[PDB]
Structure formats: structure tokens, C-alpha cells
């Protein structure tokens, strides 16, 4: 039905939470999982992260105790998502936002907090928590040097775990009908794991709670698990710290699973590909930890995994195959990159141009001919396409179909220069280039053309498909 959203909401803050639990049957069937892998889609909140909750939560507490008045400044050390949630709360309730975040975090989080009118101070990646150059220490300095400022300090604020204990875990309980056998959850500030594990073990003591910690952090128990990569920088954002936060109750968690960058990102892309959840990398870490932890579970048993972040914050980072190839991360089991590598391989456009049959007789023009002059060439030379080129060096492609249709449409005058109706989006290639690169380039450009300034022809996706039909 429609219970929580059946009316109109006063602000975006009322749209935080109430995320849907989805059964990842496709991903489990891919990875060979007997139990039901339930996913709590926290990335479907208004701000696209679970931390929205605590943000709102902390503000509410700060307002229910009168500790916060309009016009004040809010300061918060964050990996980016708590900053986004608090920035939403401030843009709604009229507070000023100053976010202190490490340079390791993505640029999308910074851009979104900038759109929310928040000042952004960045701290070095390799800094320890004791440092004055840590995000927490810089936030403390901003408190000390600025008036009417407040640090809500999600690492020690009781609201962070208390609201995960109050609403989120109760949501999971109501959605799983109490039958929860394993809960796999990443460990950042540790508030979400603490609260969820407590409420679930209180209303279902038989549930195992598994914490996910990146290879590089010291949050796992025992230290025999953290010493694979001690204090090694990692790319996954949100989970793991160089100290145990005040809100993290490591006694409430049963197991610990160590997950590296490669597994986290490949599993995040597998989540996107197999389920269709536009989710973050920390979520890939959590899901890989869950695939390791719930392996011994049987069918009927339900393992709840949080998907904290949305792909929005890492849209340039790991959704782009460019970045994960540069960082040497396995793309995916089934991906477009691997499909192109298998189908095309090392075949080059020399091979396609020779197998198809062409003698580089692609007529050029100086890109400022009148359309009547060029139609004489189109109709008399028996060619359909032409390539327009300037002096200062490529302009584009032109088809007689577009000529006729734009002349009828009122965009192509008979005395107009040919540059006005040519296709201006192109991708330059050269015969030694592989078909995998032209396949990647066709994802962004309609045509791929090759190149004394002697271009040999144009290649589109139908050409590659018809080549694949010959193989």
C-alpha cells in the first residue's frame, strides 16, 4: 500500500530512511549461495546513503536539547556521506555547513556538498587521527576559532548508533519478520553495526552479526586479521579507521571479515550488473564479506547486508572502467569489457577494412562548400556519405539523408555552408588500433574514423556487428 509517503512531506529530511529490502537472487545464484541474501538498500534514501539518517538524527537531538539555533555553523569530520546528510539538514533548517574530509574521498561528494552551500576543507590521506591535519583535528580547530560553531562528532555522538538501533534495525526486523540469521555490515564509524546488531540480537538473539573491515584498518578482532595490510591506504571509502570510534561496540559483533579493494570493487560492479542496484563500493565490500560469511548458511535462512552508498558518489571513480583498469582491479566476471576482449580480441581495423573491402576512396571536402555544390557531388559521384574537413584538423561527417531532411526541415539552406549540417561529434583512430578500443569509443561517439592527411574510412557499430556476423 502507501503508508509513509501517502501524503506530502514538509522537507527532504522526511524522505530519509524507509529504504526497501531486496532479495539478491541473481547475485546469489551467480556466486552459489544457498541462503537468501537480503540487501537493505540504504542508498535509496534522499541523500543516497545510510548516513543521512544520523545526520538528521543528530540535528534533531541538537534541536530537542536547544543546543542549536538558526544561523549557526555545523562542523563535521566525515568521509563524505555524513557531510552530505548534515548539509541537507543545514540547507533545510538554515545552518551553515563546514565539512572536513580526507583527500582520498571522491570528488562527487565534494561537488554535492558544494551544491549544498558547504565549505569544504580537505585533509591529507596519510594523516593519522592524532594529527592536527586529521579531519577530526581540523574540525576541532574550526570549532575553536569560529563562533556559534558546533561539532556533532558522529564518531562519539550517541545519536549515530541510537537511531540505527531505533528505526533502521526495527525496519529490518519488520521487513524480515524477525527471522534474521546473519547480518553483514561494514564498519566505518561503527554506529550502524552497533545499533543494528544490538536491536536485532535483542529481538532475535540467534542472529550472527558480521563486521566488514577493509584491509588496512584496525577495526577487526583479533589483530591477526588486521596485519595483512597494516595502515595501508585503500580506495574503498567509508569503512575502516586507524582507531576504534567511541560509538563502536566491538563486543556486539561476532565475526570479522577482511575485504580488499579489488574484491570490493569487482563485487560492487557485480551487484550493479546482476541485480540492478546502482550502489557504492563500500557496498561491494559488504556484499563480498557477506558472501564469505553466510557461505555455511542453508536455504530459508536470511542474511541481511547493508548497501550504504549509491553509485552517485563514485560515478567517475569505479563505474568508469577507465579508473578500475588504471588501478588494476578485475573488471567483472560478466562485463562489457571482457565481452569485447573475447569477441574482438586483438583484431585491428586493418583486419576489418581488408576483410570488408575498401580502397580508402572516401571523398573529402573543404567544409565550406555550398550545399548545392555538395549535392552535385553526392548525386553524381554515387557516394552517400562525405567527410568535411577544415584548414586549421577534422570537422565531421555528412550524409545525403540529413541534407534532404534538413532542407525540408528548414535548417539547410541551398546557399548555406556545408559545415552547418555536418555531424560534429567524431572519434579519431588509426589502422593499428584494436577493435576493443573502437568499441569503447563507439560508446561515446557515433562514428569512428581513421587517418599526408589521408583518412581511410568511417566505422560504426553496425560495421562491428556485421564483422562479428562474419566470425
User: Is residue 237 at the binding interface for its own copies, with CB under 8 A as the rule?
Assistant: no
The response to whether 188 counts as a known ligand-binding position is: yes
The residue within the footprint of its own copies, chosen from 79, 274, 282, 286 (CB under 8 A), is 274
The residue within the footprint of ligand P1T, chosen from 17, 47, 102, 191 (CB under 6 A), is 191
Between residue 345 and residue 384, which ones bind its own copies under the rule CB under 8 A? none
CB contact burial 232-270 (16+ within 10 A = b; e otherwise): eebbbbbbbbeebbbbbbeebbbbbbbbbbbbbbbbbbb
User: Is residue 57 at the binding interface for its own copies, with CB under 8 A as the rule?
Assistant: no
C-alpha cell at 39: 540487501
User: Is residue 352 at the binding interface for ligand P1T, with CB under 6 A as the rule?
Assistant: no
Between residue 260 and residue 299, which ones bind ligand P1T under the rule CB under 6 A? 280, 282
Q: How many residues bind its own copies (CB under 8 A)?
A: 118
**Beta bridge pairs of residue 302:** 36
User: Is residue 269 at the binding interface for its own copies, with CB under 8 A as the rule?
Assistant: yes
Through-space distance between the first and last CA atoms of the chain, rounded to whole angstroms: 52
The response to whether 190 counts as a known ligand-binding position is: yes
The response to whether 157 counts as a known ligand-binding position is: no
Q: How far is the CB of 191 from its own copies (least distance, A)?
A: 22
User: Is residue 334 at the binding interface for its own copies, with CB under 8 A as the rule?
Assistant: yes
Neighbours of 177 (CB within 10 A): 8
Dihedral of the CA atoms 69, 71, 72, 74 (nearest 10)?
110
User: Is residue 309 at the binding interface for ligand P1T, with CB under 6 A as the rule?
Assistant: yes
70 to 89: interface string for ligand P1T, x by CB under 6 A: --------xxxxx-------
Between residue 133 and residue 152, which ones bind its own copies under the rule CB under 8 A? 133, 138, 141-142, 145-146
The residue within the footprint of its own copies, chosen from 140, 315, 413, 433 (CB under 8 A), is 315
3-state secondary structure of 231: coil
Residue 171 or 309: which CB sits closer to ligand P1T? 309
Distance CA 153, CA 58 (A): 9
User: Is residue 300 at the binding interface for its own copies, with CB under 8 A as the rule?
Assistant: no
User: Is residue 321 at the binding interface for its own copies, with CB under 8 A as the rule?
Assistant: yes
User: Is residue 413 at the binding interface for its own copies, with CB under 8 A as the rule?
Assistant: no
Residue 239 or 421: which CB sits closer to its own copies? 421
CB 196 within 8 A of CB 184: no
Residue 320 or 366: which CB sits closer to its own copies? 320
CB 89 within 8 A of CB 13: yes
Distance CA 414, CA 272 (A): 50
User: Is residue 409 at the binding interface for its own copies, with CB under 8 A as the rule?
Assistant: yes
Is 51 tagged catalytic? yes
Task: Determine the Cα angle at 23 with ends 20 and 24, to 5°.
Answer: 120
Q: Which of 25, 29, 40, 51 is catalytic?
A: 51
Q: How far is CA 152 from CA 73, 170, 238, 245, in A?
A: 11, 24, 18, 14
3-state secondary structure of 102: strand
CB 355 within 8 A of CB 332: no
Between residue 86 and residue 115, which ones bind its own copies under the rule CB under 8 A? 87-88, 91-92, 103, 107-108, 110-112, 114-115
CA-wise closest residue to 237 among 102, 115, 52, 137: 102
Distance CA 143, CA 245 (A): 20
**Binding annotation for pyridoxal 5'-phosphate:** 81, 188-190, 192, 282
Footprint of ligand P1T (CB under 6 A): 49, 51, 78-82, 186-193, 237-239, 280, 282, 308-309
Which residues are catalytically annotated? 51
Amino acid at each position: 500500500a502507501d503508508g509513509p509517503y501517502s501524503g506530502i512531506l514538509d522537507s527532504v529530511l522526511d524522505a530519509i530512511g524507509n529504504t526497501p529490502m531486496v532479495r539478491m537472487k541473481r547475485l546469489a545464484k551467480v556466486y552459489g549461495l544457498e541462503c537468501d541474501l537480503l540487501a537493505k538498500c540504504e542508498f535509496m534514501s534522499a541523500g543516497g546513503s545510510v548516513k543521512d539518517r544520523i545526520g538528521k538524527a543528530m540535528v534533531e537531538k541538537a534541536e530537542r536539547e536547544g543546543r542549536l539555533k538558526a544561523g549557526d555553523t555545523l562542523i563535521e569530520p566525515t568521509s563524505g556521506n555524513t557531510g552530505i546528510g548534515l548539509a541537507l539538514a543545514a540547507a533545510v533548517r538554515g545552518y551553515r555547513m563546514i565539512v572536513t574530509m580526507p583527500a582520498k574521498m571522491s570528488a562527487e561528494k565534494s561537488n554535492i556538498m558544494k551544491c549544498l552551500g558547504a565549505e569544504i576543507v580537505r585533509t591529507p590521506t596519510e594523516a593519522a587521527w592524532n594529527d592536527e591535519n586529521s579531519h577530526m583535528g581540523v574540525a576541532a580547530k574550526l570549532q575553536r576559532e569560529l563562533e556559534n560553531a558546533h561539532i556533532l562528532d558522529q564518531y562519539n555522538n550517541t545519536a549515530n548508533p541510537m537511531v540505527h538501533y531505533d528505526v533502521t534495525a526495527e525496519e529490518i526486523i519488520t521487513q524480515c519478520d524477525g527471522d534474521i540469521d546473519m547480518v553483514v555490515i561494514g564498519a566505518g564509524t561503527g554506529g550502524t553495526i552497533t545499533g543494528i546488531g544490538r536491536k536485532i540480537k535483542e529481538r532475535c538473539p540467534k542472529c550472527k552479526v558480521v563486521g566488514v573491515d577493509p584491509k588496512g584498518s584496525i577495526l577487526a578482532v583479533p589483530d591477526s586479521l588486521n596485519d595483512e595490510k597494516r595502515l595501508q591506504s585503500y580506495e574503498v571509502e567509508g569503512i575502516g579507521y586507524d582507531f576504534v570510534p567511541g560509538v563502536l561496540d566491538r563486543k556486539v559483533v561476532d565475526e570479522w571479515v577482511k575485504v580488499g579493494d579489488a574484491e570490493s570493487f569487482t563485487t560492487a560492479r557485480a551487484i550493479i550488473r546482476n541485480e540492478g542496484l546502482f550502489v557504492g563500493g563500500s557496498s561491494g565490500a559488504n556484499v563480498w564479506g557477506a558472501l564469505q560469511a553466510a557461505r555455511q548458511l542453508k536455504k530459508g535462512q536470511k542474511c541481511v547486508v547493508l548497501l550504504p552508498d549509491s553509485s552517485r558518489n563514485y560515478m567517475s571513480k569505479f563505474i568508469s572502467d577507465e579508473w578500475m583498469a588504471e588501478h588494476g582491479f578485475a573488471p567483472e566476471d560478466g562485463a562489457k569489457v571482457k565481452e569485447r576482449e573475447k569477441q574482438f580480441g586483438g583484431a585491428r581495423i586493418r583486419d576489418l577494412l581488408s576483410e570488408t573491402g575498401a580502397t580508402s576512396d572516401v571523398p573529402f571536402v573543404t567544409a565550406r562548400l555550398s550545399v548545392e555544390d555538395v549535392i552535385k557531388m553526392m548525386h553524381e559521384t554515387k557516394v552517400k556519405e562525405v567527410i568535411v574537413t577544415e584548414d586549421s584538423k577534422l570537422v565531421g561527417v555528412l550524409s545525403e539523408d540529413h541534407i534532404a531532411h534538413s532542407l525540408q526541415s528548414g535548417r539547410c539552406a541551398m546557399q548555406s555552408p556545408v559545415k552547418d549540417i555536418a555531424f560534429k561529434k567524431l572519434a579519431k583512430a588509426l589502422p593499428s588500433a584494436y577493435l576493443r578500443d573502437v568499441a569503447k569509443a563507439l560508446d561515446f561517439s557515433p562514428y569512428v574514423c581513421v587517418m599526408c592527411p589521408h583518412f581511410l574510412g568511417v566505422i560504426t557499430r553496425i560495421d562491428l556487428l556485421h564483422w562479428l556476423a562474419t566470425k
